[PDB]
């Protein structure tokens, strides 16, 4: 019959359906710019070390909660990027690269050096400089705006955000303590801490639990939530991590 | 302009 020509064409279709074309690669639509090669090397490194912990734990499956970003605003085109940590400190990444981190009293003023990566300067709000007066006006505006109509909350040093990157599927946060946090369009979140060994999961309804990664991989899924597509989400993390680990010049 | 989940 002509079913032979049909069955053969069918078979070739199934083979081709197992390969890719027009497949999405991670593209950053927004990220803070780092004007230091050394700063990038430190970032790239941290991505590699943390990735290694994932991969080591991936080939090897056969509880302290990390600091996280509770809310954020990418206003990069106007004022700058803002965020709030589980410590309820507020940071603002200014478009020049500098940062002001106001504690829960005082604030840190951060920027980077071509010879020393990141540089920080602690101040008292009492003793704030006149030159940094506009910065804290912007922080004050971000602090109040974020309180009013952004929603989330969390329950041994000062931590700031070195790098954020917004992809279509998720926004990725690189904190200064080596923690990585991923916010998915699924409204599911997870944070990778402690060299890649520990994984934290935050729910759409804001339930958060920290678990060893080996265990979670022993489960084959986060224990509470089956709706969370963990395998795919851990794959995106890995793709995101690897991409950054090679960004060492700009 | 983008942001996290609203209140
Ligand atoms: Cl930007």
Numbering used by the authors:
A (entry chain A): 435 to 496, 508 to 549, 552 to 602, 610 to 704
B (entry chain C): 228 to 234
What does the paper say about this structure?
Like Plks, Cdc5 contains a Ser/Thr kinase domain followed by a polo-box domain that mediates substrate recognition and sub-cellular localization. The polo-box domain is made up of two polo boxes that together define the p(S/T)-binding pocket. Cdc5 promotes the release of Cdc14 from the nucleolus and regulates the mitotic exit network (MEN)9,16–18 as well as cytokinesis. Here we demonstrate that the polo-box domain of Cdc5 uses distinct surfaces to bind phosphorylated and non-phosphorylated substrates.
